[PDB]
């Protein structure tokens, strides 16, 4: 990222999660395929 | 209450306390959240019935005696004798009520009353008991389904690997054993 | 009907929204706490140094330091409890996904109201959504039995 | 001609010189409370052949700042008078205007009986009226002056139905005088139009003093628009002269995206409004909220002291001929008397007076045993 | 004398009326006979204005009691709630209703057996994680 | 080393519209974001590092 | 208030407000944990029911 979110420059940051949504989607699709077939 | 507990209604103390920022907006929110959670707990535990049932006036369940758990109409409050004993064995300090050391709390410490009166909880328990003694466990799926109590007991025996003829051959003995055990 | 019900009622996803709302409010309060005098001459360091000589200016700003430390402690103190309750919820969700989805459940009223047949999981931001398929008797008719 | 009317949403100014936009901000300062009565004081003196005694300059209390509103053409009302007694033995203020000047001073002004009036009081035929003067009778001992740009200026309005209501609010605190003013146009048909407007700072001045009255210097040399009636007791009339009183309230202003205040809400008017102030938002959802606490205010104070007549002999100890040696110090006892601790400064010119457990300032409000 | 004050209001997007609850105070005293220049809050215009009801959780001012049985919306305490609806609209304070009354029929020689089913699909939402941070 | 600011940043310029007699720019969390020009009467723009 | 002048009364009164705040914080801090314990017990009771 480069109003409140950019204002938190005093030392309060937010780390990103390790797993992106496109991998949780792959997990969900695999579970659905396994439980259907 | 921060202002009354920390400062004895002194303007100067309040003026200096206001300089600390929001160190009491947070302390006035956690307790409200706790109170909301405690109000929600008793509703989540007891309120599991869509409607309120009532036991039939005629009470004969094949020898099983349920008079110690069904509501007692003689008392002013519809509470079973076991519930009466449990209520008597526990003494609350102040509850909510309306107004020796509880009067020494002029310092901003109070207690809110619970949302659900004990009578409503007793009614919930009575409805659950009527549903579970009249309709078996079928009332947990949808609407109540009739079934005589001895056949329900035989079916519960069948569910644990004992042939259902055992109960019908020993109904009176099991009824007497249950009556002695619950007494 | 699940899609239409979700699109109509907006309060269904009230459990997930609070997770981000509480954190945003906590961060906002933590940021806003800086503009407090904490019982000192001023809430800004530059002016308090530029207005006073060292020997008591150093004494004055200690109040700011202790106030800011006390403000910072409470944030992590509350975050620990929030993380604990979130861990409990995550463990419950993991148990549900390992039991209802990967098989059939005999526990009463665990994987849905009624008799359990299947379950299909779905992914939501900072959470998981299940779709329980159940079985319910419909039409009743009494008889005479022996 | 005195009547009372309700001020709906008027009497608000910029809290500070600081820019702020697209947020909600909370301030604590002297403001004009919402939904309060405003009095109408009117002048009736016209015609030369026939007329009546005017007595059209009432004295106003000026209780720690006032809010001024008046509708005129350019110069019907000029100047404002402060002070506490307004006599030769006391100081009075002379904030008055001019064509392109402002005159402000404080002095021992003795007499201000009646402004110079030609008794003609008829502008329907001849409207030539200038240089009435008679600002004061005499000045005794004073030099301060504030010759500068005039505070008020006239606005041009054509095609009719453009009248400007003049909002002046004065702040007399901490020995300094602060004036906030703004011109509100479009006073077509409503005497007190509904809406919202903002005032702006003009200048500060270190006056001080203990000003406790207000006086008006309306120019009665040529007057117009003068209805007359015996209206009293919260009625409606026409005065073109509004005055208000300021109370120490708390408001929550709503700065727009352009930095101009659009809406303001009172925090001590309505429990709905107080809830809005507590939640710091202009919309509140259905539910129950715990806002504040209520306490019963006291009525009066009572003092209960033992009755002792004779005075304490501090002169016998401090004014003594001989003092004993340090190794044989003699201890004296003072009892059964009323002690005044503000008199021991005179007995000797000491200034160490290092006092440990109690502040010397408030020694007179505590009762001891010996 | 002192106590907590609460405001019971519907959504401001719908109406503009409010009610005041004085927590844990017997309102036979001053709270029903309030006077100007005597109470901490600046607003005293409400005063009594009739419609005063006594609850075991305090005194409710500004809401008319009606004895019915609805599923209550705004909790108050001690089995009392409030809601903004009809008796022209105002704010009422009824008694909470647990549910519709029903009576079951029981016999020792009768049984009920279903003849049809119904497949239904429900939902369940569970949080799994919260947003990380560092300082 | 301003007239009471003593800021520190990468200040470039303000394109926003400001009221004529206002100097201090402020935000939601009450931080300085604008500075008047003592010579050119122009609003500056405080921006952190 | 009645025995010390404000210049040192403010100094003396500041030593009580901090202590009372520190004493009040611990109460809610411990209640926040007792509430979690009670909630866990309530969940167990609901499951058992
Ligand atoms: C079910 O049990 C209750 C009590 O366990 C029985 O009531 C008692 O009856 C005896 C004699 O009939 C009395 O002496 C007791 O005083 C009773 N106790 C109470 C609490 O009522 C009741 O009779 C039993 N039901 C049947 C059908 O016999
Ligand atoms: C004790 O002695 C001192 C000095 O000899 C006296 O001080 C006078 O006090 C009065 C009180 O108003 C003053 O007006 C005088 O100016 C002081 N004079 C001096 C020289 O200090 C004091 O009066 C004596 N005590 C008594 C009771 O007479
Ligand atoms: C069990 O319920 C189903 C669903 O209500 C019944 O099927 C319906 O039958 C009627 C008339 O035969 C049709 O008009 C509906 O369209 C059917 N519904 C569906 C979803 O197809 C079924 O008849 C019931 N069983 C019995 C024995 O009556
Ligand atoms: C970071 O740099 C990349 C590469 O030019 C650019 O595409 C991106 O917009 C930059 N991120 C910003 C400006 O926030
Ligand atoms: C079945 O129930 C209905 C209503 O509950 C009743 O009228 C009918 O008599 C019952 N059937 C038998 C065989 O008792
Ligand atoms: C304002 O006018 C009303 C009208 O009768 C009157 O009751 C009230 O006392 C006046 N003063 C205030 C401060 O409301
Ligand atoms: C008004 O201004 C004019 C022009 O500056 C000046 O000559 C005149 O003396 C002023 N009036 C007063 C009363 O000072
Ligand atoms: C007031 O003015 C007169 C002359 O007009 C002067 O004699 C007197 O000293 C002045 N008052 C004071 C306190 O100086
Ligand atoms: C702010 O200024 C812009 C620019 O003219 C204008 O379009 C907008 O309407 C203004 N906002 C108001 C008046 O609330
Ligand atoms: C409240 O006060 C009334 C009048 O003094 C009294 O009769 C009553 O017992 C008190 N307590 C209540 C109503 O719970
Ligand atoms: C209960 O309702 C009836 C019918 O409206 C009414 O006559 C009676 O006064 C009510 N009782 C109470 C205590 O409000
Ligand atoms: C069912 O209960 C009634 C009630 O006492 C009884 O008369 C009847 O004999 C019971 N049925 C059988 C089959 O015993």
Numbering used by the authors:
A (entry chain A): 835 to 836, 849 to 883
B (entry chain B): 737 to 835, 849 to 932
C (entry chain A): 933 to 1078
D (entry chain A): 25 to 394
E (entry chain A): 591 to 677, 689 to 736
F (entry chain D): 542 to 590
G (entry chain B): 981 to 1029
Sentences from the paper on this structure:
Compared with the RBD of BA.1, BA.2 contains three additional mutations, T376A, D405N and R408S, and lacks the BA.1 mutations G446S and G496S. S371L on BA.1 is also substituted with S371F in BA. All the S-trimers contain Gly-Ser-Ala-Ser (GSAS) and 6P mutations along with the T4 fibritin trimerization domain for increased stability. Of note, one RBD in BA.2.13 was clearly disordered, representing a stochastic movement, which, together with BA.2 and BA.2.12.1, suggests structural heterogeneity in the S-trimers of BA.2 sublineages. Of note, S-trimers from the BA.2 sublineage harbour relatively less compact architectures in the region formed by the three copies of S2. By contrast, BA.1, BA.3 and BA.4/BA.5 spike possess relatively tight inter-subunit organization with more buried areas between S2 subunits. In line with structural observations, thermal stability assays also verified that S-trimers from BA.2 sublineages were the least stable among these variants, which might confer an enhanced fusion efficiency. Additionally, the BA.2 subvariants displayed slightly higher binding affinities for hACE2 than the other Omicron variants. The results reveal that the lack of G496S in BA.2 sublineages meant that the hydrogen bond with hACE2 K353 was regained, increasing their binding capability, in line with experimental observations revealed by deep mutational scanning (DMS) assay. Despite this discrepancy, we conclude that BA.2 subvariants and BA.4/BA.5 are able to maintain high binding affinities for hACE2.
Owing to multiple mutations to the spike protein, including in the receptor-binding domain (RBD) and N-terminal domain, Omicron BA.1 infection can result in substantial NAb evasion. The Omicron variants that have emerged more recently contain similar RBD sequences to BA.2, with the addition of L452 and F486 substitutions—L452Q in BA.2.12.1, L452M in BA.2.13 and L452R/F486V in BA.4 and BA.5—and exhibit a transmission advantage over BA. We expressed and purified the prefusion-stabilized trimeric ectodomains of BA.1, BA.2, BA.3, BA.2.12.1, BA.2.13 and BA.4/BA.5 spike (S-trimer). We determined the cryo-electron microscopy (cryo-EM) structures of these S-trimers at overall resolutions of 3.1–3.5 Å.
